[PDB]
Amino acid sequence: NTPVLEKNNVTLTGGGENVTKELKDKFTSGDFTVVIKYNQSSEKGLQALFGISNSKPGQQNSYVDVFLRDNGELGMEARDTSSNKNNLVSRPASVWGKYKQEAVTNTVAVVADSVKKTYSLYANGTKVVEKKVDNFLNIKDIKGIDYYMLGGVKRAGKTAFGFNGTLENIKFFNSALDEETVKKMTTNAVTGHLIYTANDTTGSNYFRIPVLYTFSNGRVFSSIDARYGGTHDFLNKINIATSYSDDNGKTWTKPKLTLAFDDFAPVPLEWPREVGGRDLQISGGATYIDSVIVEKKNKQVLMFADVMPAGVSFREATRKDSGYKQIDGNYYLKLRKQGDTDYNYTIRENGTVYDDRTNRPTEFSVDKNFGIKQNGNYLTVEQYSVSFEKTEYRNGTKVHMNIFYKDALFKVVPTNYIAYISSNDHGESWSAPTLLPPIMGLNRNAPYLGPGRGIIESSTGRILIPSYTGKESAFIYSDDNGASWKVKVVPLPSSWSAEAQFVELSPGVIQAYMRTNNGKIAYLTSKDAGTTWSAPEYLKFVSNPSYGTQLSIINYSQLIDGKKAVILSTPNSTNGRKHGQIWIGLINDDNTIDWRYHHDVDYSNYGYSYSTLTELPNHEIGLMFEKFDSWSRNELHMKNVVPYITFKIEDLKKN
Ligand SMILES: CC(=O)N[C@H]1[C@H]([C@H](O)[C@H](O)CO)O[C@@](O)(C(=O)O)C[C@@H]1O
Numbered sequence: 001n002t003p004v005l006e007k008n009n010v011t012l013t014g015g016g017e018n019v020t021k022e023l024k025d026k027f028t029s030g031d032f033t034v035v036i037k038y039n040q041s042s043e044k045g046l047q048a049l050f051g052i053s054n055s056k057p058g059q060q061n062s063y064v065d066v067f068l069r070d071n072g073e074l075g076m077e078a079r080d081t082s083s084n085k086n087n088l089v090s091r092p093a094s095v096w097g098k099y100k101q102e103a104v105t106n107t108v109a110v111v112a113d114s115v116k117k118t119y120s121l122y123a124n125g126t127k128v129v130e131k132k133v134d135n136f137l138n139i140k141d142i143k144g145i146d147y148y149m150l151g152g153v154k155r156a157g158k159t160a161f162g163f164n165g166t167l168e169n170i171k172f173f174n175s176a177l178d179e180e181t182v183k184k185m186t187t188n189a190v191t192g193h194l195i196y197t198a199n200d201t202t203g204s205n206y207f208r209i210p211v212l213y214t215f216s217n218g219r220v221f222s223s224i225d226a227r228y229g230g231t232h233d234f235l236n237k238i239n240i241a242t243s244y245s246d247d248n249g250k251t252w253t254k255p256k257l258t259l260a261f262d263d264f265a266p267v268p269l270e271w272p273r274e275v276g277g278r279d280l281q282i283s284g285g286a287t288y289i290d291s292v293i294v295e296k297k298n299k300q301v302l303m304f305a306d307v308m309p310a311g312v313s314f315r316e317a318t319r320k321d322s323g324y325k326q327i328d329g330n331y332y333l334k335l336r337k338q339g340d341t342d343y344n345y346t347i348r349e350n351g352t353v354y355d356d357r358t359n360r361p362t363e364f365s366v367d368k369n370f371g372i373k374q375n376g377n378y379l380t381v382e383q384y385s386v387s388f389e390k391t392e393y394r395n396g397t398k399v400h401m402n403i404f405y406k407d408a409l410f411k412v413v414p415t416n417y418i419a420y421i422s423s424n425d426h427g428e429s430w431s432a433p434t435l436l437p438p439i440m441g442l443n444r445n446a447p448y449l450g451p452g453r454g455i456i457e458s459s460t461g462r463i464l465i466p467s468y469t470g471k472e473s474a475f476i477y478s479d480d481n482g483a484s485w486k487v488k489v490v491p492l493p494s495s496w497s498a499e500a501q502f503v504e505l506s507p508g509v510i511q512a513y514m515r516t517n518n519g520k521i522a523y524l525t526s527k528d529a530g531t532t533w534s535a536p537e538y539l540k541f542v543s544n545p546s547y548g549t550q551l552s553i554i555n556y557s558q559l560i561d562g563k564k565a566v567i568l569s570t571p572n573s574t575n576g577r578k579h580g581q582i583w584i585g586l587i588n589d590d591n592t593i594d595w596r597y598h599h600d601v602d603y604s605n606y607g608y609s610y611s612t613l614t615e616l617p618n619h620e621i622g623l624m625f626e627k628f629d630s631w632s633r634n635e636l637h638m639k640n641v642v643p644y645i646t647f648k649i650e651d652l653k654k655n
Contacts, residue, residue: 001181003171007150010170013041014162016051016152023052023148026174030138032112033173034066035185039103040165043070043603048161049108050170051153054081054144060155061086062142066110066121067161071578071605072097074123076110078137085135089119091128091273092635093628096190097603100651105168107186113176114138122182125191126198126640129273193643195222195243195624201254202226202241203266207642209451209550210624212614213293215301215426220245220614220622222644223258223291223303229282229386230271230637231630234313237264237285240305244427248616249646258430259305259421261286262399263406264384271637272388278636280390286310286404288419292465294454296482300422304465306449307417307435310406314416319445322438323413325356331437335403335410345410353410364410368432371400372410381407415445418467422482439476439487440469447474447487450499450514452552452612459507460529466512468498473512475530490524490533498522499550503566505591513539513568515548521570525591541583541595542572547631549577550610558619560586560649566593567652569611569623573604577629580608582621582652599652601625601645607635621647 004026010017036049046067053063061081068074075090096104109122117136121129139145147154150170151163177185198205204226211223226241240259243252257266264285272278287308294302308317325334325346332346335353345362346354353364365373372379379401382394403412419433440447450466457464465476473490492498500514505525512524512533520538553568563586573579580601585593601608601623609626616622624644628635 001173001177004174005172007167007170010150010167012151012163012165012167014159014164016159016162017150018147019150020146020148023172024146026172027139029114029175030140031114031174031176032139033109033175033177033182035107035109035171035182036066037105037107037168037170037188038165039105039168040068040097041103042164043097045070046161047163048153049151049163049167051149051161052139052145053147053149053154054142055147055154055157056144057156059144062144063153063155064112064137064139064142065153065161066108068095070603072602072607074108074121074128076119076121078112078119078142080137080142082143085137087119087133087135087137089121089129089131089133091121091638093607093638093641094121094123094128096124097606099602099645100647101654103165104190105188106190107188109182109186111176111182112138120179120182122186125183125187127179127183193645194640195252195644196224196226196241196255196642198639199268202239202257203268204228204239204241205268205271205639206231206637208626208630209290209610210612210626210642211291211293211452212612212622212624213295213453214614214616215295216299217426218246218617219426220249220616221293221301221427222252222624223293224642225289225291226257226266228264228266229269230278232281232636233289234308234315235281235283235285235311236287237282238287238289239266240288240291240303242427248618248620249622249644258303259288259419259433261288261402261404262383263310263381263402264386265395265397267385269386270388273637278633282386283392284310284384284406286402290449290451292449292451292454294456294463294465296463297456297461298481299426300424301427302420302422302454302482303430304418304420304449304454307404307419307433309404309412309414312414312416314448317415317445318413319415320443321413321415322440322442322444322446323415323417324438324442326442327356333435334413338409343413366403370403370433372403372408379409381405416448418446418449436476436485439485440474440489447476450501451550451610452501453554455502455504455510457508457510457529458504462529464502464510464530466500466502468496468500470497471495473498473500473514473524475512477530488530488533493536494518496522497548501551501553503553503555505587509591513551513553515550517546517548519544519546519548519574521551542570543574544571545574545576549631552611552613554613554615556615560584561596563587563594567613567621569613569625571608575605576607577609577631578607579604580611580625582613582623582647584649584652597653599647599655616646619649621649621652623647
């Protein structure tokens with residue numbers, strides 16, 4: 001594989017460079033590969049990295065280019081005027097803009113393969129898109145190609161889509177190179193910011209909902225949603241994966257599955273991004289989603305998660321049943337047996353399944369992972385697989401029958417639950433899950449967790465876990481170091497998806513920062529360790545779309561400008577989930593916050609959705625975030641889009 005042309009350190013501010021002499025008559029087949037290492041000096045406007053065109057008047061629509069948008073989209077066009085053929089292939093959120101005050105160096109590539117009739121695009125080690133098109137065009141197919149340009153496209157004798165930046169290195173090949181060669185050629189520093197990668201140990205092509213936490217030992221812990229049937233919240237097959245770093249985030253463990261069902265296996269699916277397929281979903285699969293981490297005072301770690309039985313969306317879960325039944329003062333999980341209409345059974349002591357009608361134990365029992373036994377032996381069901389030719393079918397593998405499955409003999413109430421697991425070794429191993437009792441009441445479903453961390457209120461030792469119902473905040477708490485759980489339900493002014501996080505301002509004084517349906521971040525204050533809550537106030541410097549986004553806010557252990565500090569991450573834009581910012585807030589003696597500093601994470605039109613902050617052992621700050629707009633139907637089912645970055649406080653002061 002030898003380049004037909006190579007150029008280096010080409011600095012441009014809109015005007016481009018003519019390379020026609022060097023490239024006219026190099027592309028005999030018509031196929032091509034172009035690999036471009038670049039950085040942008042200005043991201044505004046549509047910019048072409050190179051352009052091969054018919055430059056004569058009348059032939060404005062006869063060209064091939066690779067382009068970048070101010071939102072980080074990478075794409076290509078291949079067009080021919082006289083035949084009115086117009087190919088466009090792209091993927092949102094493909095490149096980085098700026099990082100810590102400097103333009104980021106990216107490496108992207110295009111492959112045009114006339115035998116396969118495909119265009120492929122690569123960015124920073126990932127094949128971001130591959131598309132077979134019917135009206136395929138290569139360089140020879142376009143009539144009268146006479147101009148070859150770096151950093152623009154010559155249309156009707158004028159430069160269009162002028163690039164602003166430096167082409168550090170650009171290589172043209174007169175053939176289609178193979179996938180692994182180009183992935184490798186595009187690998188760079190950007191590629192190293194992934195902790196979870198598509199089709200890693202987890203078997204998932206997709207991830208959403210990152211969480212970071214630092215343990216007392218100096219381990220930095222991460223969890224994430226491993227979402228297997230694309231990035232849909234529901235319906236989907238979702239596991240919680242984890243990974244950790246014992247060296248201040250420089251290196252991470254291979255990801256482990258920590259909360260998982262096996263009614264479907266953990267295997268990679270190629271989820272359609274086209275408008276006609278992207279609404280496809282994995283239907284019948286039990287799920288964990290939305291993790292919350294806290295470390296207790298005794299150094300045991302807790303992790304909570306939402307639990308969804310197979311076929312239960314957030315929208316279709318019954319809201320008028322907890323899934324639990326009260327018998328002689330105790331709460332017990334109800335079960336319906338196949339062929340019954342009513343819920344005649346309960347799980348009591350030792351997981352023994354009781355017939356409530358007779359008040360006698362049956363021969364069935366439920367294990368600590370919700371698996372169903374009969375006379376002490378496991379019942380089985382066939383595992384499902386997914387295939388695209390979409391079809392879901394039984395694959396011949398037997399797994400334990402489970403109360404959360406579609407094919408179970410005994411089934412839970414089709415509603416959402418909360419489960420928690422604990423670790424005595426800083427997240428190397430975990431207990432079996434405990435389903436949370438019906439803290440909201442017997443005739444109400446469980447709340448939904450606000451992903452991220454919980455806190456320990458220093459003065460009382462109260463454990464606080466943020467959650468919400470749709471209409472209320474539900475602050476789940478324990479006053480006996482996690483042996484028992486209660487909830488403070490707080491009515492909100494409207495139907496907020498009130499994903500929240502807590503900070504402590506001073507002893508006894510806490511604030512819950514949350515998403516709303518009004519465009520603002522709300523904060524509620526408690527001066528009695530969470531027992532009662534003030535009316536909401538709103539941050540005046542963040543302005544988001546009405547749907548909102550999850551946020552992250554943490555306490556920071558070191559003084560900044562002599563003051564106690566908190567650190568907030570959120571998008572900040574009414575155009576979408578964009579324009580990520582980190583804000584440093586300094587607490588005053590009266591417990592108001594001086595929001596003194598902010599730092600923009602990349603350019604304002606680049607994507608920034610859910611995020612998580614942690615303080616590193618060395619007092620740097622770790623950030624992981626969805627670097628795309630996770631609301632947009634245009635940015636679903638994207639691979640390798642949740643990076644991790646470390647900041648110094650001095651970095652966060654700038655902007
Ligand atoms: C990559 C891309 O989007 N290209 C499109 C451009 C841009 O929208 C520019 O803003 C306007 O030149 O608009 C066209 O009408 C054009 O100029 O022929 C169609 C073309 O497909």
